[PDB]
Design a protein around this nucleic acid. Structure first.
Ligand SMILES: Nc1ncnc2c1ncn2[C@@H]1O[C@H](COP(=O)(O)OP(=O)(O)O)[C@@H](O)[C@H]1O
Ligand SMILES: [Mg+2]
Lengths: 107, 95, 86, 93, 516, 93, 107, 88, 98
DNA sequence: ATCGGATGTATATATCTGACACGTGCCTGGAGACTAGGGAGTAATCCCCTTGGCGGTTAAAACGCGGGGGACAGCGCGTACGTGCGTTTAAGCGGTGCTAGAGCTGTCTACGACCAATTGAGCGGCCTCGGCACCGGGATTCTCGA
DNA sequence: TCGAGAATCCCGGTGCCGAGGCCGCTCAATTGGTCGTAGACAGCTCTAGCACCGCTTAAACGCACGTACGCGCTGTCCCCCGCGTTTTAACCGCCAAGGGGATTACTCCCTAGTCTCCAGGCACGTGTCAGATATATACATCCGAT
């Protein structure tokens, strides 16, 4: 009668039991199905990996090991899908993309 | 002695590459807790709250200045004028 | 608190600070009338956000404004901020 | 006391997509807030969908539709593929 | 008489039992089943039972003297029947075949009304737009001493005519089209309308038609309908005709429907149609087209049961199995597979023989055109689809024959020019493309002799009218109908339904005119 | 097939502001949509506000704070006064 | 005893009971208080009365005795705080405020 | 010959006529309109329409219906942040 | 010689007659055709309702009118009276759409 | 077109400090029975959709043309900005002390959930009669060329 | 510059359709009673926010000088508006038959929620060490004047 986690059953890294509890206690619906936590945890893990790979690539380009909010901001703003997803979001200690209008540069 | 524009472009490149806050901390904190006294008397502020306020304010101002610059360029200038800020806010819906 | 309440602190948002914000925004040349306009817009933004945050903290029957209240106010206004909880 | 967080899991994903790098505390807090924000957005859309369709339950179909409705294009289709893969593997076990 | 004096009789400056009593008194002289409608809508309609509970012969022998020219004896009989219809406070339907002459009879009867009992208007005449001039010409020719106007043109011209003559009451006949009646009812709702005449009453079939509703709002002493073929498909349509005629009597559609159509009695047969003959004998008059005409010889109608083609079979099976959202797709496939997008072989397109054998019908079609072409005959294809008629046009190009096409998108001047050139003396015009329900009745293709109904229609009346484009008065050599049917397909179904409709019409109406 | 709406209630409110004045069907539908939207905004804000403070009940305090957060400026104090007036009258009767 | 609607007991016109039921069924919280429906009904009544008064004023200005979407739009957009509340809302069969820029006017 | 290849039916976006863009511009309050405005307007119109219709179709697919409804369109507009009053 | 109106005096009259009516300014059938054409690229074999198409047209025309107002302000800011595609692009980019 | 300066840009080296690994408790997620009600499957049904064709009105839409005025470019100029240098001044930092008040724990009671009966409120269906849309025509106003 | 000439506003008349009562019924409010259990209030505690204070030194302020850029003026095309044909497509009204989605109404199963236990995964507290600053220093490279 050994207990193995739902995350291990589904082959994920994010917690399925915690997602289930959050869905149940978040006042979203009267009832919560069994596959909804698994689907939502898989989606969250995919999105985390997608953003975090780009952040790691930016950090390597900057010749750094540990990633920082600047690298997170660079990844998000350079990738167009992520830039559209996090359009109305400001990142603490992030910054701006290097961008100068062509008219301002000297002739 | 450099010519008008060179130092400005160097400053643009410097500040578009850094990450810190461009406003001094105590003056902004004084402004925040003076504005706050108009809604409730004898308030206290978490340092984290003041820092979050400062970063949100700075992000808002930078995003506003980008649109102001584009408005100035659209009128065939390189100088930003108050009419540009007013137009940017009006178009964005804030005004 | 009772700490000799002050005025005209909007002048603490100084001309070089506004110029640095403009430079990060990518502005090369700046007219001399822009500083008062910037002070006005900053004051309006801060008034709105602080009003919402104080409303939250007063509903919670507290006397301290917290980063969580500020974050909730910003999200309420549609300017989600990452890095202070939530 | 005992505030929950997604750190321990974001780290597990990070040390399989780049098993050489690290992550700072501010970056980890940003990642945690991002995960929470996306969770809230998806769950709110799913609850609204269930309320619209007079349903009383939230299930993988509503989760998939909310994902397809909130994410743009390639992200949406890849996330849908990952979710369906995970659900099928879970049920066949 | 005088416009100002006649204003006192035209304009409406202001339970009609007054004429209803005489109507019922004369009508109940026939079988007692006539009162069944009232015994129903007396419990249903109490106000109409106040007449049931309580309870001049002018043969007019010779052709009218007041009309120009001579008038045919059968038309004399018809106009006398109209006179009898008038002097009973009842209304009927004249249903002589197309080309037999009905406008002359109607205007002679109007001359009767104006010169024997002295009521100079008002008279409303409703007809299709193409016919209006062909009404005015007879108005001016047979009885010249009468004023009438077509009430046509843009808004400004029609308003000017209204102010000048209509409100001024300077008319006797106000001939107007179907669309004008709907367009201008308020200026036209108050003339008190002695009669309202409707040529080609096929239009007034649906009781929900805007024309129907508008016409019910008019106030008229009595009505009259002219239509070559009543009861096209259903029996409820004949009920609607009668209801428009006399709403006093035929006010119960469900009664008439459950009486014969909605419920046909489980007896052997023909009792209900005997009662129908009794009921409609005093109301509707129709004569045989060939009663006095000789001339036109009867048609040699034939069926060509064609099979199917390999590609046609493939497409038909593909349609049967389950981008296409109708059963008509089967009728397209059974007609010609090229109507679908992709059936044509290759983004490069040609016109060689690769279409003739690919379509089942068009094979025998080409054989028949050839056989007639070395015999000296002309063809009047009447397909049901303009889009397919383009395919047949391309095929005719390949065989190097001569078009003359009138679809529904052909401008009126182009239509009349095509009719002129084809119907002209000897000319290089072999085939004549045409879509069945097009052009109305203003086509006189009497030069040719062979017609091929390429498709079949849901109601037989459309096909019969199409076949009358060559069987009318005129052409006096031969007629060869060559309708094409493909077997083991929905075309058999539509043919069967058309046949049953034609049989119903035959039994109901085509036994009356034998007695007439 | 029953379908509820605030039609009779909005009409009752209108008949005491402009005693002799009607309203068309489209304006009625617009007012119904407006009431539904405002209800949804206030209720959602109250729900979030109760969730932040780890409460489980939505009460007049959450509703009042929600209207203060949502309604603009001088339009908020009149609504607050009306709400408090109604609450006191109901709890005294 | 004899029934008395909570709307009448609170001196309102809006349905307190219906508001309470919607608040319980809307998946907003586990429990709802007793004065929350009363407060919410009072607020809704105030807002609808305000907008209807402005709309009736506009309709009487146009010499008409029915409120139409044009009058609703014209009343909403002419009030600063009502317009701020309905900034992102569009009114079907509404229109725009008569407004021509002064530069566009003839000299 | 070769008439079986009937027409092109030029474009439903071209169905948005230059007078129609001009009328919308007049309601917006503009005096003079450049000749190139009528293509940019069609482009932005098509972009907006696809953005809304995608979400409406998503809603009606989730509901397992086959008919886009005014409620679905309203929900899509609300999701994009363009609340519409008057259709439910 | 027939009299003629100076350029602009009819544009202003149209402006003040269109800022006063309420009906829809795009034809109905062309818009319906465009809507169906766009919709059949996401999933084939759909159908719409008249109310759905009317709501979509309402939202669409509101969007374009609100865009043309900001375009006019951009053109005026540029010391012009003629609106050009630059103005639409600027108004859309500042607004955040693209 | 070449020199002379000023400003990043790599390249080494010391210093922290704050990620990262490890050990310890406990609260929460998993296993297992039991149950009821939500939702899925079936089946009537029925009204509105579909496709292909027809006929007619009537405004809009498309096109052509003239001509005016507005955009665009070029030129001058005279401020109003930028750049740089001294001179103060206030932020930023490190340190300390105090106390308000966030945050946690325990009790218990008032108040919301739940359930059974009862019954008025509100919703669907039906009908009618005024409010508003439409149409002359007359008067008034506004523009444009003398 | 005043007198055409056009467009718009303002009066009457129709007329028609939808707003606004009126009625029946049925189904959610309402009332009364019972029962947990959230939150409200007291009490404690220990943390972090506030208030001074001294020192350093970078940043802000004030002022000069001198370009270059914003703004005004003047021409010149050209392109867009106003107006008169003329062409066509939207918009009604129709036909002919299906059947296909959307919507109740009903039955039943199977999958959720609800309990009771109980291990073990995650949060917290600690203790390194190596990644990222924090100085210096030589080199490359633009920039602005020659
Ligand atoms: N003297 C005449 N006597 C009888 N009929 C005539 C006389 N003169 C002409 N006609 C025919 O009467 C016909 C009227 O029929 P028509 O105009 O085809 O309409 P319908 O087919 O409805 O009767 C004309 O075609 C014309 O040939
Ligand atoms: Mg005839």
């Amino acid at each position: 009668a050994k207990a193995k986690t739902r995350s291990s059953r589904a082959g994920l890294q994010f917690p399925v039991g915690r997602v289930h509890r959050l869905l149940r206690k978040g006042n979203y619906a009267e009832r919560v199905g069994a596959g909804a936590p698994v689907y939502l945890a898989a989606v969250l893990e995919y999105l985390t990996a997608e953003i975090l790979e780009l952040a790691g690539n930016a950090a390597r380009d900057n010749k750094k090991t540990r990633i920082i909010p600047r690298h997170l901001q660079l990844a998000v703003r350079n990738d167009e899908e992520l830039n559209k997803l996090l359009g109305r979001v400001t990142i603490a200690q992030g910054g701006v993309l290097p961008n100068i209008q062509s008219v301002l540069l000297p002739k | 002695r450099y010519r008008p524009g060179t130092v400005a472009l160097r400053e643009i490149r410097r500040y578009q590459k850094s990450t810190e806050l461009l406003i001094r901390k105590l003056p902004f904190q004084r402004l925040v807790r003076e504005i706050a006294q108009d809604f409730k008397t004898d308030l206290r502020f978490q340092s984290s709250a003041v820092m979050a306020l400062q970063e949100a304010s700075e992000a808002y101002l930078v995003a506003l200045f980008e649109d102001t610059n584009l408005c100035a360029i659209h009128a065939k200038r390189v100088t930003i004028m108050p009419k540009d800020i007013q137009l940017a806010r009006r178009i964005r819906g804030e005004r | 608190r009772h700490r000799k309440v002050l005025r005209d602190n909007i002048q603490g948002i100084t001309k070089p600070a506004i110029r640095r914000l403009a430079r990060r925004g990518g502005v090369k040349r700046i007219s001399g009338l822009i500083y008062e306009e910037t002070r006005g817009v900053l004051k309006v933004f801060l008034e709105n956000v602080i009003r919402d945050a104080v409303t939250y903290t007063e509903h919670a029957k507290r006397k301290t404004v917290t980063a969580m209240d500020v974050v909730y106010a910003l999200k309420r206004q549609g300017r989600t901020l990452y890095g202070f909880g939530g | 006391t005992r505030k929950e967080s997604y750190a321990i899991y974001v780290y597990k994903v990070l040390k399989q997509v780049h098993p050489d790098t690290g992550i700072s505390s501010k970056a980890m807090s940003i990642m945690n807030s991002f995960v929470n924000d996306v969770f809230e957005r998806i769950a709110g859309e799913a609850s609204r969908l269930a309320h619209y369709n007079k349903r009383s339950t939230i299930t993988s179909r509503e989760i998939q539709t909310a994902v397809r409705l909130l994410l743009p294009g390639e992200l949406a289709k890849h996330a849908v593929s990952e979710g369906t893969k995970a659900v099928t593997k879970y049920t066949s076990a | 008489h005088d416009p100002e004096s006649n204003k006192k009789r035209y304009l409406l400056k202001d339970f009609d039992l007054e004429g209803t009593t005489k109507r019922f008194e004369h009508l109940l002289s026939l079988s007692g089943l006539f009162k069944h409608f009232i015994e129903s809508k007396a419990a249903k309609d109490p106000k109409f039972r106040q007449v049931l509970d309580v309870l001049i012969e002018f043969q007019f022998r010779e052709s009218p003297a007041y009309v120009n020219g001579q008038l045919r004896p059968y038309q004399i009989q018809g106009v006398n029947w109209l006179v009898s219809l008038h002097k009973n406070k009842i209304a009927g339907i004249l249903a002589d075949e197309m080309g037999l002459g009905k406008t002359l009879q109607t205007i002679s009867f109007l001359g009767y009304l104006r010169y024997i009992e002295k009521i100079p208007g008002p008279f409303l005449v409703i007809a299709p737009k193409s016919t209006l001039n062909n009404w005015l010409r007879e108005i001016n020719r047979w009885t010249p001493d009468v004023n009438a106007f077509i009430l046509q043109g843009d808004k400004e011209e029609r308003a000017e005519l209204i102010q000048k003559k209509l409100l001024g009451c300077d008319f006797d006949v106000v001939i107007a089209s179907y669309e004008i009646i709907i367009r201008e009812k308020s200026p036209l709702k108050k003339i008190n309308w002695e009669y309202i005449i409707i040529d080609e009453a096929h239009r007034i079939k649906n009781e929900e038609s805007m024309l129907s509703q508008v016409l019910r709002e008019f106030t008229s002493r009595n009505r009259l309908l002219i239509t070559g073929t009543p009861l096209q498909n259903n029996l409820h349509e004949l009920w609607a005709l009668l209801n428009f005629l006399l709403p006093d009597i035929f006010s119960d559609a469900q009664d008439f429907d459950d009486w014969f159509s909605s419920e046909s009695t489980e007896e052997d047969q023909d009792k209900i149609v005997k009662q129908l003959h009794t009921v409609l004998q005093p109301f509707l008059l129709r004569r045989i087209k060939s009663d006095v005409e000789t001339s036109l010889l009867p048609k040699k109608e034939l069926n060509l049961y064609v099979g199917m083609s390999s590609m046609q079979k493939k497409w038909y099976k593909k349609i049967l199995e389950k981008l296409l959202n109708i059963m008509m797709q089967l009728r397209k496939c059974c007609n010609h597979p090229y109507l679908f997008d992709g059936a044509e072989p290759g983004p490069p397109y040609t016109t060689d023989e690769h279409l003739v054998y690919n379509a089942a019908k068009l094979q025998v079609l080409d054989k028949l055109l050839k056989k007639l072409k070395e015999e000296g005959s002309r063809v009047l294809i009447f397909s049901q689809m303009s889009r397919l008629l383009d395919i047949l046009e391309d095929y005719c190009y390949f065989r190097n024959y001569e078009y003359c096409r009138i679809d529904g998108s052909t401008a009126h001047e182009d239509r009349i020019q095509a009719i002129d050139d084809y119907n002209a003396p000897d000319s290089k015009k072999f085939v004549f493309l045409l879509t069945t329900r097009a052009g109305g009745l203003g086509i006189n293709l009497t030069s040719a002799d062979v017609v091929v109904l390429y498709d079949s229609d849901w109601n037989p009346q459309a096909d019969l009218q199409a076949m009358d484009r060559a069987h009318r008065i005129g052409q006096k050599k031969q007629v060869k109908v060559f309708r094409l049917v493909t077997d083991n397909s929905v075309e058999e179904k539509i043919l069967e339904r058309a046949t049953q409709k034609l049989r119903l019409d035959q039994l109901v109406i085509q036994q009356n005119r034998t007695s007439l």
